[PDB]
């Protein structure tokens, strides 16, 4: 963790896995833990585990930041009802705007369920479209039935 604390995080990208690497063996193996090489691992035809680890590390930073958006018992934060109430465009373009949407969403479980199902269906389509184009698991690409 000395690179992590010194801030020289490029040492974790230095020395990536070689193109002659064989999965599960030390021959052709690097030392990098967090890379952004892109493409695919040549032997397995799946994305690099260093790339995937860096993905999950970064994406988590973003989500842990975004999880400090809303106000909970410490003053600093946002008020969702206030946000929805104020978001009304000028001259009543979208009528009264988003007034009342907080109340309807937080009172009606069916609207929450519908939003969740729509988002999750879009995500399921996204994973279906992305797994085949960018395989992540070793030797899955040659496994045509799976």
């Amino acid at each position: 963790l000395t690179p992590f604390f010194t801030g020289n995080w490029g040492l974790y990208a230095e020395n990536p896995d070689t193109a002659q690497h064989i999965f599960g063996t030390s021959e052709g193996a690097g030392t990098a833990i967090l890379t952004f090489l892109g493409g695919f691992h040549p032997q397995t035809q799946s994305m690099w585990l260093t790339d995937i680890a860096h993905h999950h590390l970064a994406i988590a930073v973003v989500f842990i930041f975004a999880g400090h958006m809303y106000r909970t018992n410490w003053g600093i934060g946002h008020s969702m009802k206030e946000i929805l109430d104020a978001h009304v465009p000028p001259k009543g373009r979208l009528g009264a705007g988003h007034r009342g949407l907080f109340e309807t969403i937080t009172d009606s479980l069916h609207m929450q369920l519908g939003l969740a199902l729509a988002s999750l269906g879009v995500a399921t389509s996204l994973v279906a479209q992305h797994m085949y184009a960018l395989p992540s698991y070793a030797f899955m690409a040659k496994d045509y039935v799976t």
Partner: peptide, 22 residues
């Protein structure tokens, strides 16, 4: 935040937002 403890930030009847939104 609850339903009650929330500022009156709707401004559809006026030309500009109240400053409280900031």
């Amino acid at each position: 935040v609850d339903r009650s403890e929330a500022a009156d930030t709707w401004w559809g009847d006026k030309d500009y937002p109240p400053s409280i939104v900031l």
